[PDB]
Design an enzyme around this catalytic site. Structure first.
Site, PDB file in Angstrom:
ATOM      1  N   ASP A 171      11.902  -4.118   5.189  1.00  0.00           N
ATOM      2  CA  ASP A 171      12.579  -5.404   5.353  1.00  0.00           C
ATOM      3  C   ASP A 171      12.724  -5.996   3.952  1.00  0.00           C
ATOM      4  OD1 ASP A 171      13.370  -8.060   5.796  1.00  0.00           O
ATOM      5  OD2 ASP A 171      11.882  -8.415   7.368  1.00  0.00           O
ATOM      6  N   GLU A 206       1.560 -13.052   3.789  1.00  0.00           N
ATOM      7  CA  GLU A 206       2.619 -12.963   4.774  1.00  0.00           C
ATOM      8  C   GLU A 206       1.936 -12.904   6.133  1.00  0.00           C
ATOM      9  OE1 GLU A 206       4.989 -10.119   6.877  1.00  0.00           O
ATOM     10  OE2 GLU A 206       4.369 -12.132   7.528  1.00  0.00           O
ATOM     11  N   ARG A 253      12.615  -9.913   3.528  1.00  0.00           N
ATOM     12  CA  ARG A 253      11.220 -10.376   3.470  1.00  0.00           C
ATOM     13  C   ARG A 253      10.573 -10.029   2.140  1.00  0.00           C
ATOM     14  NH1 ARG A 253       5.473  -8.645   4.480  1.00  0.00           N
ATOM     15  NH2 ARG A 253       6.285  -6.793   3.367  1.00  0.00           N
ATOM     16  N   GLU A 281       0.893 -14.343  17.619  1.00  0.00           N
ATOM     17  CA  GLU A 281      -0.027 -13.417  16.962  1.00  0.00           C
ATOM     18  C   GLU A 281       0.064 -13.510  15.439  1.00  0.00           C
ATOM     19  OE1 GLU A 281       0.860  -9.540  18.734  1.00  0.00           O
ATOM     20  OE2 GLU A 281      -0.505  -9.970  20.399  1.00  0.00           O
ATOM     21  N   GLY A 340      -4.688 -10.618   3.979  1.00  0.00           N
ATOM     22  CA  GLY A 340      -4.059  -9.605   4.826  1.00  0.00           C
ATOM     23  C   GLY A 340      -3.166  -8.736   3.973  1.00  0.00           C
ATOM     24  N   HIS A 391      13.095  -8.396  10.116  1.00  0.00           N
ATOM     25  CA  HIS A 391      12.395  -7.745  11.215  1.00  0.00           C
ATOM     26  C   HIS A 391      11.928  -8.742  12.264  1.00  0.00           C
ATOM     27  CE1 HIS A 391       8.566  -8.889   9.291  1.00  0.00           C
ATOM     28  NE2 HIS A 391       7.968  -8.537  10.440  1.00  0.00           N
ATOM     29  N   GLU A 413      -8.152  -7.162   3.493  1.00  0.00           N
ATOM     30  CA  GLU A 413      -7.430  -6.485   4.565  1.00  0.00           C
ATOM     31  C   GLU A 413      -8.422  -6.023   5.623  1.00  0.00           C
ATOM     32  OE1 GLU A 413      -4.334  -5.925   5.747  1.00  0.00           O
ATOM     33  OE2 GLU A 413      -5.479  -4.920   7.325  1.00  0.00           O
ATOM     34  N   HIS A 418       3.849  -0.958   8.696  1.00  0.00           N
ATOM     35  CA  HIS A 418       3.978  -1.239   7.263  1.00  0.00           C
ATOM     36  C   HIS A 418       5.275  -0.767   6.688  1.00  0.00           C
ATOM     37  CE1 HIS A 418       0.078  -3.179   6.840  1.00  0.00           C
ATOM     38  NE2 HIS A 418      -0.336  -2.297   7.771  1.00  0.00           N
TER      39      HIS A 418
HETATM   40  N1  LIG Z   1      -8.369 -12.231   9.496  1.00  0.00           N
HETATM   41  C1  LIG Z   1      -7.840 -11.254   8.729  1.00  0.00           C
HETATM   42  N2  LIG Z   1      -8.407 -10.885   7.562  1.00  0.00           N
HETATM   43  C2  LIG Z   1      -7.892  -9.915   6.788  1.00  0.00           C
HETATM   44  N3  LIG Z   1      -6.774  -9.249   7.113  1.00  0.00           N
HETATM   45  C3  LIG Z   1      -6.098  -9.524   8.249  1.00  0.00           C
HETATM   46  C4  LIG Z   1      -6.601 -10.566   9.142  1.00  0.00           C
HETATM   47  N4  LIG Z   1      -5.759 -10.630  10.184  1.00  0.00           N
HETATM   48  C5  LIG Z   1      -4.788  -9.697   9.978  1.00  0.00           C
HETATM   49  N5  LIG Z   1      -5.008  -9.034   8.828  1.00  0.00           N
HETATM   50  C6  LIG Z   1      -4.152  -7.990   8.229  1.00  0.00           C
HETATM   51  O1  LIG Z   1      -3.075  -8.677   7.593  1.00  0.00           O
HETATM   52  C7  LIG Z   1      -1.933  -7.826   7.477  1.00  0.00           C
HETATM   53  C8  LIG Z   1      -0.678  -8.660   7.749  1.00  0.00           C
HETATM   54  S1  LIG Z   1       0.836  -7.763   7.556  1.00  0.00           S
HETATM   55  C9  LIG Z   1       1.258  -8.126   5.860  1.00  0.00           C
HETATM   56  C10 LIG Z   1       0.774  -6.992   4.945  1.00  0.00           C
HETATM   57  C11 LIG Z   1       1.166  -7.086   3.451  1.00  0.00           C
HETATM   58  N6  LIG Z   1       0.566  -8.305   2.821  1.00  0.00           N
HETATM   59  C12 LIG Z   1       2.656  -7.127   3.236  1.00  0.00           C
HETATM   60  O2  LIG Z   1       3.203  -8.215   3.021  1.00  0.00           O
HETATM   61  O3  LIG Z   1       3.362  -6.105   3.272  1.00  0.00           O
HETATM   62  C13 LIG Z   1      -2.184  -6.685   8.460  1.00  0.00           C
HETATM   63  O4  LIG Z   1      -2.399  -5.518   7.654  1.00  0.00           O
HETATM   64  C14 LIG Z   1      -3.458  -7.072   9.212  1.00  0.00           C
HETATM   65  O5  LIG Z   1      -4.348  -5.983   9.447  1.00  0.00           O
END
Ligand SMILES: Nc1ncnc2c1ncn2[C@@H]1O[C@H](CSCC[C@H](N)C(=O)O)[C@@H](O)[C@H]1O
Ligand SMILES: Nc1ncnc2c1ncn2[C@@H]1O[C@H](CSCC[C@H](N)C(=O)O)[C@@H](O)[C@H]1O
Lengths: 326, 326
Positions: free
Chosen positions: B16, B108, B19, B117, B43, B268, B65, B10
């Site tokens: 970043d 994101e 981003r 992934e 997420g 990143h 999340e 994080h």
């Molecule tokens: N199916 C799902 N449902 C909910 N959260 C998810 C998910 N798959 C991944 N995530 C979460 O989504 C996040 C993506 S990273 C982006 C995090 C934040 N929105 C930012 O922009 O800074 C990660 O914390 C991961 O744990």
């Protein structure tokens, strides 16, 4: 065959000029003792140290190498036209069969924190089995140092969350606690390069390993280390301790020292950092003392474990035990 | 609990700025469409994008999340006094239960090479389940680009072995073949940041993903991509191809583009590199063409696989298929 790791590891070692020149010069300065003599190179890798020994005048070098890089060693030696002076042999030094005892052993066996995944046991096995009485060991000894540190990069990472407001108008300062627990609250040894200004006191030697010393194998199994004490230079947030090593090559003349200290040019070994659970503020003349032991991990005998008991200033004694970074 | 990875991941994303400002501004420029409306943040991580949506005027944001960082998200929101406007909810978006359909989704979701992934399937699941007809998706689309490259850092690593003679008087030039096979002969996608001068031709868009498009899930399963063709700028040793993406946020006004191109400020994500087995010399006007497909790996459906068929100049067509770096 897949060999990305093969090349990268050896590239990193040979690219480390501090390391490689120390061996280059440490071996050459012993030319009078090597000229017309035999050498065993324990863990020859690409063969570089074996060729250094030949340059120093050795009649015969046995370049023993357990992994697939032996193939490259063979090629480097043939290509430099030294196949009659340097004999690259496959497989672990523990089972190699040599035609003779040797006059000297050369080896770069040191791991992170000196002893993490090191080849020291193999070098000592080879010393016992193959080295002539009074034979030369290069390097001959290793010493371990500890000092309290303030890690500038860690400080930046701890402060990061309070800088988010300035960049994005969202206050994340409330995450400092979280960052601290995550970055410092773990029990892993962290390999990281520090500079001279991170060092908070006079570094203290806490162990000395004389490679010829009888029973060194049993010492390593029980754990090496000792007590230490020092006094801080000024106001700082102490994050923990750094440990590092040096190894010494006898001269013809003064010994040559390969050091991994943060005051000396950086090497690929960097230093091994032992973070406290949270920062502690220290001041000029703050006493910092402790006892540290480096020993094999229970579940993996090649993995380094550190037992640390320490006291900072008027704070009560604390224990924190570490195991090397995955 | 152990959380080094939690904070580091994080920290890297929020650090970043390219981003994070792209999302900051991309969301804010849509204020007229978000003011007094509801948003699902798929997420939410630390909650940063959810708070951006609130700043943009959203009445209610659902911050969903799946991992333990949700705990930190909850804290950031409470600390900024937005618990009545931003609702942090635990667990996967696929099973979250919301009180209402939403006016907008922000996420994101992009991985290395866009699709390694990535959370794209989750975003599309959420779009289908929770987004109102005509709802806003932020970003709305993604595009993929390919170009032939000459990687300066790789070139340095390939040349390294021929520099050993100069440093240590040992000739290791004979190891170039070895280095090439190891560094280029593998079948792994390498994530690495390139600069503008590494780019050998005009980059070509090979795919466009409109997130609202019906059947996009089935496209992703079958594989996305297409043919490409370009012409080289001058004499260079071509090492392979780089691929990268951009995503687009609709404006109030012109769209805002978050780009990961080597010509644009570094992110990143860097770029994804597809190395040929060995370098090929190209010249001004050397034609380079091919066909590329990005699709799920067989053994791990979340892991990116790349199918590449290419032709450089007068050389015969070649196939090289890749799978993402471990
Ligand atoms: N199916 C799902 N449902 C909910 N959260 C998810 C998910 N798959 C991944 N995530 C979460 O989504 C996040 C993506 S990273 C982006 C995090 C934040 N929105 C930012 O922009 O800074 C990660 O914390 C991961 O744990
Ligand atoms: N028991 C053992 N016997 C022989 N070689 C070993 C060994 N344990 C480790 N090695 C090898 O020892 C090497 C140590 S790295 C040092 C390589 C080279 N001497 C140089 O200085 O550049 C590795 O290549 C490793 O494969």
């Amino acid at each position: 065959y897949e060999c990305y790791s093969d090349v990268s590891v050896h590239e990193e070692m040979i690219a480390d000029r501090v390391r490689t020149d120390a061996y280059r010069l440490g071996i050459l300065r012993n030319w009078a003792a090597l000229r017309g003599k035999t050498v065993l190179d324990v863990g020859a890798g690409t063969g570089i140290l074996s060729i250094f020994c030949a340059q120093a005048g050795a009649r015969r070098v046995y370049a023993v190498e357990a992994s697939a890089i032996w193939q490259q060693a063979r090629e480097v030696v043939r290509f430099n036209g030294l196949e009659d002076r340097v004999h690259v042999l496959p497989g672990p030094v523990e089972t190699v069969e040599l035609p003779e005892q040797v006059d000297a052993i050369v080896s770069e066996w040191m791991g992170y924190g000196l002893l993490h995944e090191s080849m020291l046991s193999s070098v000592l096995h080879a010393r016992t089995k193959w080295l002539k009485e009074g034979g030369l060991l290069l390097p001959a000894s290793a010493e371990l140092f500890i000092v309290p540190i303030s890690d500038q990069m860690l400080e930046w990472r701890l402060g990061f969350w309070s800088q988010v407001k300035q960049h994005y108008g969202v206050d994340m300062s409330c995450l400092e606690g979280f960052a601290t627990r995550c970055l410092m609250g773990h029990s892993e040894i962290v390999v990281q390069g520090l500079s001279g200004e991170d060092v908070l006191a006079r570094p203290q030697r806490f162990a000395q390993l004389e490679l010829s010393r009888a029973g060194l194998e049993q010492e390593l199994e029980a754990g090496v280390g000792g007590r230490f004490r020092c006094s801080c230079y000024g106001s700082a947030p102490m994050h923990g301790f750094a440990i590092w090593f040096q190894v010494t090559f006898p001269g013809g003349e003064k010994p040559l020292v390969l050091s991994t200290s943060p005051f000396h040019p950086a090497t690929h070994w960097k230093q091994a950092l032992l973070y406290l659970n949270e920062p502690v503020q220290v001041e000029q003349d703050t006493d910092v003392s402790g006892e540290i032991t480096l020993l094999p991990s229970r579940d993996n005998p090649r993995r380094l474990r550190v037992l640390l008991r320490y006291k900072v200033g008027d704070q009560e004694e604390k224990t924190k035990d570490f195991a090397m970074e995955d």
